[PDB]
């Protein structure tokens, strides 16, 4: 007897899953929490040849009205996954198990989207999310992005640096903090380490990192993140809701539509000239710390957008 | 200086890349061989923010006319030491490569089997996509629920089990397998059950909305079997649903002489098929790759 009009895909220990279950319970809708992490051992999934033939723990779930996709946990290296001991035992069968799970849950989510479920960030957007492709998709569509160079060739790095000036490097797909390109990094000894993996070099923008939240083609807020460095022993972070011009808004909405996102926390940043460049759009953006430090409500609009799909 | 009008993504050590290259070479079009197995340690690619700024080994390769995608992707020393890092490193490489491909596709390149198809290709969703669009598919059940498979058998009759994905011989579900002890093995080992079809395993190749051939795989001996225009229509439809440009499909016939689509493949092999039934697969493929250079 469970209602599956709103499904929150994710583990119930994810603070953001909890936050949405609560934003939803307090508006009336109990949600169905779909934890893939317990698929083989503690969950039942059965799929029939018909896209409507979907049975989770015995109950049929043909078409939720809306899904909030926090994470499918496809990789053992994913955020909310403790797979360390299993990977230290056999990295091969664990990878196999995660791919085995992935194809089934992906099939569930794709069947749902086919049926008309409003998936708040459908996994199909993965293709447009690839950053070296995402930034070009935005650039050639008229949004400004940093002067970039994804590469494994040190000479390309040297010439891009001589073209641009101060530069940062950061991961191609993600997983580490961006850091200033220092002169030590251009010495042969370490710049030749690009043969192990490419990295992303970009023009060092000096302005303000602004996080813009977009839900269903509307900007919820725009939070300016400032690093307070008056005291070097307690460097803190001040986050402030700010007004952005309508031009900037419409550009963020366009970008969200280009990549294929419904709920997106995108990061932009201004150059020396005080004008924003798009840095990245996130497919399962977090919001809790921003809400807290900036005194805004992001979870509320998301829950309302989810509930508006049942109507 | 190279042509880069037609790009073959794959290793030179691969027989298919070889056939396709040799066949292309013969036809007059020398291709480029993006041997992405060399990517980090040997070759170099550089991407700029402008989709055209794609530089492989120093030579700009924006917008090829057509791409044949075969393959894109030793680690035990590294994963047993740091698996999180090694997985992340491989993700960095694959991200750069997948991008090159996606950039080409956005710019106009007819990629023969674009990676975007992977979404539509996930089988427990692929067969639902085929069915829900009116195509004949076998009754199927993906499950880890033993009660579900007991009723699926009871409803469809004798049936088979094929792996959830990948490679293992299709086997017949026998009554001995339905006992508590034997059936409970799927409590954590999901496989795909399907109504047992009795007709011939027939493989059909589709390129640009046209069937090329069909061979009854009956030492195994496979031979060409012409089929109705109806099933051909159904085949090209299925390939246009999944979003493939060159596909090698498996279809099987029921007892009533009607065919059911079993599976389309992201990049099907053809060397061990055109050398056992005497038809030409690589030829029409190269013809299509060249034909795009006029669009």
């Amino acid at each position: 007897n469970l209602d599956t009009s709103i499904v929150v895909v994710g583990s119930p220990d994810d603070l953001h899953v909890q936050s949405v279950t609560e934003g939803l319970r307090a508006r009336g809708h109990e949600p169905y929490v779909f934890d893939t992490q317990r698929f083989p051992e503690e969950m039942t999934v059965s799929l029939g040849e018909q896209g409507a033939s979907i049975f989770v723990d015995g109950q049929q779930i043909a078409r939720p009205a809306a899904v909030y996709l926090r994470s499918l946990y496809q990789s053992p290296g994913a955020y909310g996954v403790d797979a360390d001991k299993a990977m230290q035992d056999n990295w091969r069968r664990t990878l196999l198990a995660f791919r085995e799970r992935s194809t089934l849950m992906s099939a569930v989510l794709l069947r749902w989207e086919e049926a008309g479920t409003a998936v708040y960030n459908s996994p199909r957007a993965s293709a447009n999310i690839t950053k070296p492709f995402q930034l070009a998709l935005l650039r050639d569509a008229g949004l400004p992005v940093p002067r970039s160079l994804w590469t494994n060739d040190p000479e390309a790095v040297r010439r891009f640096h001589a073209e641009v000036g101060d530069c940062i490097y950061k991961p191609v797909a993600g997983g580490a903090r961006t850091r200033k390109l220092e002169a030590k990094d251009l010495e042969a000894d370490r710049i030749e380490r690009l043969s192990a993996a490419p990295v992303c070099f970009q023009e060092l923008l000096t302005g303000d990192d602004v996080r813009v939240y977009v839900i269903d083609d509307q900007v919820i807020c725009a939070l300016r993140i400032v690093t307070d460095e008056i005291d070097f022993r307690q460097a803190e972070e001040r986050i402030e809701a700010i007004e952005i011009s309508d031009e900037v808004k419409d550009q963020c909405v366009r970008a969200a539509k280009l990549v294929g996102l419904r709920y997106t926390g995108m990061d932009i940043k201004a150059g020396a000239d005080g004008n924003y460049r798009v840095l990245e759009l996130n497919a399962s953006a977090m919001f809790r710390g921003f809400e807290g430090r900036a005194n805004v409500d992001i979870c509320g609009p998301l829950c309302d957008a989810l509930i508006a799909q049942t109507k | 200086n190279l042509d880069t009008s037609i790009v073959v993504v794959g290793s030179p050590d691969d027989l298919h890349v070889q056939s396709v290259t040799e066949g292309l070479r013969a036809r007059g079009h020398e291709p480029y061989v993006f041997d992405t197995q060399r990517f980090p340690e040997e070759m170099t690619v550089s991407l700029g923010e402008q989709g055209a700024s794609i530089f492989v080994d120093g030579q700009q390769i924006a917008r090829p006319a057509a791409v044949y995608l075969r393959s894109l992707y030793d680690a035990d020393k590294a994963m047993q030491d740091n698996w999180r890092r090694t997985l992340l490193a491989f993700r960095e490489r694959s991200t750069l490569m997948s991008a090159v491909l996606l950039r080409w596709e956005e710019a106009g390149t007819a990629v023969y089997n674009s990676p975007r198809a992977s979404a539509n290709i996930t089988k427990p969703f692929q067969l639902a996509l085929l069915r829900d669009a009116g195509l004949p598919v076998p009754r199927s059940l993906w499950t880890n629920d033993p009660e579900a498979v007991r009723r699926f058998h009871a409803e469809v009759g004798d049936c088979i089990y094929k792996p959830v994905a990948g490679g293992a011989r299709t086997r017949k579900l026998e009554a001995k397998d339905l006992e508590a002890d034997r059936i409970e093995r799927l409590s954590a080992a999901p496989v795909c059950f399907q109504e047992l079809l009795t007709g011939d395993d027939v493989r059909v190749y589709v390129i640009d909305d046209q069937v090329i051939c069909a061979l009854r795989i009956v030492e195994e001996r496979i031979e060409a079997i012409e089929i109705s225009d109806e099933v051909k229509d159904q085949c090209v439809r299925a390939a246009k649903l999944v979003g493939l440009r060159y596909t090698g499909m498996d279809i099987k016939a029921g007892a009533d002489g009607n065919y059911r689509v079993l599976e389309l493949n992201a990049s099907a092999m053809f060397r061990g098929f055109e050398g056992r039934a005497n038809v030409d697969i690589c030829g029409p493929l190269c013809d299509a790759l060249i034909a795009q250079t006029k669009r």
Binding site: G77, A176, A196, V199, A285 | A89
Partner: peptide, 18 residues
């Protein structure tokens, strides 16, 4: 790796919002 801190678990939430 050039960015030596990729696989450092210091999971690090640098990949959280992905």
């Amino acid at each position: 790796l050039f960015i030596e801190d990729l696989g450092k678990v210091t999971t690090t939430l640098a990949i959280g919002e992905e």
